[PDB]
């Protein structure tokens, strides 16, 4: 009983995640998480009828996908045509006790799944990790502003898309005054989204919602 083996733990030193709409990294495993570990999140499609999604696996602490370490990329396709947001692409990052990162994307509606396996770097990589941590600390402000702009644009894009769906469904029951007001606000929001002014995007989202209440009633009344 005198002899024994030394107990160690593997920890991820940098967040792990995938690229999502807007070129942003979305984290599935937090920095400083002990191995083994398994995390999953559900994602969906960005357009109606989209038949595939790209899963681009990233490691690092920056907000722009391009500024993190690319670990791998694969597609899940054969997604049958559906409205945006209907597919349920569950993406699971599972790192086993051997440091192997297993990435799965499965459409839970259909059971269709694709996978990749990413091996761990053979030690030592202290300088690489340090350089990535430093790079994120130096740019923490700029990255934060990028992330907030992307989030804002994606929210405006969400409001734009579901409001348009509700107009289309409202059809001729939408009075012309309302139709014109909403359509005009849709255009103004669409223009704000091309900007870099978060306040202006939020202002146009609020103006759109303010003129969309008759619409929501009809939408609610089939």
């Amino acid at each position: 009983h005198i002899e024994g083996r030394v107990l160690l733990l593997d920890v991820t030193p940098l967040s792990l995640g995938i690229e999502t709409m807007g070129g942003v990294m979305t984290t599935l495993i937090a920095k400083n998480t002990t191995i083994p570990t398994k995390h999953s999140q559900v994602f969906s499609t960005a357009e109606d009828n989209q038949s595939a999604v790209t899963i681009h696996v990233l490691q690092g602490e920056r907000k722009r996908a391009a500024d993190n370490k690319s670990l791998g990329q694969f597609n899940l396709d054969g997604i049958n045509p559906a409205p945006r947001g209907m597919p349920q692409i569950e993406v699971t990052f599972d790192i086993d006790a051997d440091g192997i990162l297993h990435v799965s994307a499965k459409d839970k509606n259909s059971g269709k799944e694709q996978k990749i396996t990413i091996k761990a770097s053979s030690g030592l990589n202290e300088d690489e990790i340090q350089k990535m941590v430093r790079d994120a600390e130096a740019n923490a402000e700029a990255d934060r502003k990028f992330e907030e702009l992307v989030q804002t644009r994606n929210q405006g894009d969400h409001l734009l898309h579901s409001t348009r769906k509700q107009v289309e469904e409202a059809g001729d029951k939408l009075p012309a005054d309302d139709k014109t007001a909403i359509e005009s606000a849709l255009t103004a929001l669409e223009t704000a989204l091309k900007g870099e002014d978060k306040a202006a995007i939020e202002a146009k989202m609020q103006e759109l919602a303010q003129v969309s209440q008759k619409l929501m009633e009809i939408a609610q009344q089939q």
Partner: peptide
């Protein structure tokens, strides 16, 4: 659900 592109 965040969104993914092709």
């Amino acid at each position: 659900n965040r969104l993914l592109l092709t």
